[PDB]
Design a protein around this nucleic acid. Structure first.
Lengths: 145, 93, 120
RNA sequence: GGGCCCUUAGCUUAGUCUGGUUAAAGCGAUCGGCUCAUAACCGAUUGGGCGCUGGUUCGAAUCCGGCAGGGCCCACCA
RNA sequence: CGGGGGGAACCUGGGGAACUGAAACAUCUCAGUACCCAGAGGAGAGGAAAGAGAAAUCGACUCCCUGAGUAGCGGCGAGCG
RNA sequence: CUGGUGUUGGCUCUUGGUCGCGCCUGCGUAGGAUAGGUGGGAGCCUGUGAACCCCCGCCUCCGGGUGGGGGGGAGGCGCCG
RNA sequence: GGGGCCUGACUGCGAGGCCUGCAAGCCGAGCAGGGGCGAAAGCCGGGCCUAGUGAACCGGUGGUCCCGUGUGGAAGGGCCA
């Protein structure tokens, strides 16, 4: 009695998994409470048809998410910050690193999705990395005027 | 009575009574002491399923029980409402 | 512990659950016979005969005898594994029911045993 | 005539499938103490070709076949 | 849009006897007959091979003639076929 | 009346028959000693740490057989007899 | 009645008769095969004789020229006992 699951259970669990039970159990518990469904061709194939469509769907958020690897990692950041000495005038965060990062030549960034922390606020030179899976490393430029 | 899926119904069968040793084995053979008419009924049970809002139930030969949930599945492609589990059952194929 | 080392390494060259031929067996007799002397090849075999039968080895139905040394060519030990299998199949009693070549295992005086097949 | 249960000193359990080994018992009479009787009431006694003809083994109640003994049930009967 | 009810037989389906025969009787016979029931129609049924069965075979189904009281079935009885 | 099945499902407790396999088991005379048969059979054992002592558990014909662990340290064992 | 060898208490038949409603029952010379006793002629197909018994059916064993559902073989029959 093949049966595709949902709410992972003991000694048989983890969604979309197919584990055969006894008609009795499936018939009057699992199917009644929506804790699984018949491993029918109908569903059984529509499973893979949603198993691939999430792997090849995630293979686009780590594929086109990787075209951003070998591009905006080496082509280092060029930030003309208005600093001065040992403590800049405007720190540095997404509102900074990213903001102007965009200006450079069209660099789209995230608010905290990178390696963010506290806004630089300290003249020198730092470098962080993107995120996640498996992410890409890029630098920074603590400029002065 | 009668199965709502397969239309299985009670058939008529005899009730043969043999005696003696089977020629197959020892010898002489078996003799029939009495033939009697009788019925063999299907092993039909009651199957309650939800489907839509109403309930619905089935007098179905146990043998076919599954075919019940085969319908309850492909029953989600039709438009079954209007408070009536009498028309919902009717509906199912 | 239970066995030595000259035997503990020989358990590495034999599958605990596998049948072999009279070629890969009469050959594996060389590497498991690691004794400072001429190890002896003894083909032990369980028979399908009654122990307390006057007309049907020992009193438990398990015959056995040696027919080779640890230095004899891998092919000269393949001549007596077929000649000792045909010597016995030449004395199967009339009313002796049950697979005669019930269980055959070939081992040396010391080295481990490898359950081999008497028909290949 | 189909099978499936079974066969030691009087009775009636043995041990035997796990041979190289001791056959013990109660009942049974006898003999003794017995007491001013008898279940004696103790005691001492007191026996088994282990059905039989044979095989293996240095060895057979025990393991090897070839036959009978009853008590057991099964079943069939033209 | 259809159904309902009727129709002398004929037809198909669902049920289905006993007297009788066996010179008793229980298997067997009468008999899937009588009868009850539902339905069809001027007919009904069946029908284009998951066949037949021994022929380098035939080629839907139905009906008549043969085959044949044969092959067989059978308290191997009566009889059935 | 009754067993086997179907309708009939979850969870544990305890348990049989089997075949795998891994370990143990055997104490009549005498024999160093608690000898399953029968064959191989002159070498394994030990630095995969042997001789020796303590704690510990199982079996026990109360004689021992034997597993684990620390210490320890270069010695045990078979033929022969 | 006694003894010495012996097993014809053979197989394959059986002219011609007794008895007789049927079917049963009884007697039987002689030919072939291979035997026993006897020197031989010969005698022997159980017993001085008349009772000691049971058609068919259905099955069991043992064989065997037989049949073996397309073919080979089986299954199961037939024939003899």
């Amino acid at each position: 009695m093949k049966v595709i699951l949902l709410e992972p259970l003991e000694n048989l669990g983890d969604v979309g998994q197919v584990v055969d039970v006894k008609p009795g159990y499936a018939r009057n518990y699992l199917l009644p409470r929506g804790l699984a469904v018949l491993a029918t061709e109908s569903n059984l194939k529509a499973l893979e048809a949603r198993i691939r469509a999430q792997a090849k769907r995630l293979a686009e958020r780590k594929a086109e998410a990787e075209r951003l690897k070998e591009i905006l990692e080496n082509l280092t950041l060029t930030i003309p910050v208005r600093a001065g000495e040992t403590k800049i005038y405007g720190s540095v965060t997404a509102k900074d690193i990213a903001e102007a990062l965009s200006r450079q030549h069209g660099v789209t960034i995230d608010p905290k999705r990178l390696a963010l922390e506290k806004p630089i606020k300290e003249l020198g030179e730092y470098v962080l990395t993107y995120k996640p899976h498996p992410e890409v490393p890029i630098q920074l430029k603590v400029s002065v005027v | 009575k009668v199965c709502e899926i397969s239309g299985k119904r009670p058939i008529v069968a005899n009730s043969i009574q043999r005696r003696g040793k089977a020629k197959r084995e020892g010898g002489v053979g078996k003799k029939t002491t009495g033939i009697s008419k009788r019925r063999q009924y299907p092993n039909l049970q009651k199957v309650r399923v939800r489907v839509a809002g109403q309930e619905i139930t089935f007098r179905v030969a146990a043998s076919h029980i599954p075919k019940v949930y085969e319908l309850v599945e492909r029953a989600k492609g039709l438009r079954l409402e209007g408070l009536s589990p009498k028309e919902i059952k009717k509906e199912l194929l | 512990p239970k066995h030595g080392k000259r035997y503990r390494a020989l358990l590495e060259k034999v599958d605990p659950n596998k049948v072999y031929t009279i070629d890969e067996a009469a050959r594996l007799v060389k590497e498991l016979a690691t004794a400072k002397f001429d190890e002896t090849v003894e083909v032990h075999a369980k028979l399908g005969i009654d122990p307390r039968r006057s007309d049907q080895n020992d009193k438990t139905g398990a015959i056995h005898a040696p027919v080779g040394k640890a230095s004899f060519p891998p092919e000269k030990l393949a001549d007596n594994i077929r000649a000792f299998i045909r010597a016995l199949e030449a004395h199967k009693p009339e009313g002796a029911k049950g697979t005669f070549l019930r269980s055959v295992y070939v081992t040396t005086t010391m080295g481990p045993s490898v359950r081999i097949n008497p028909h290949s």
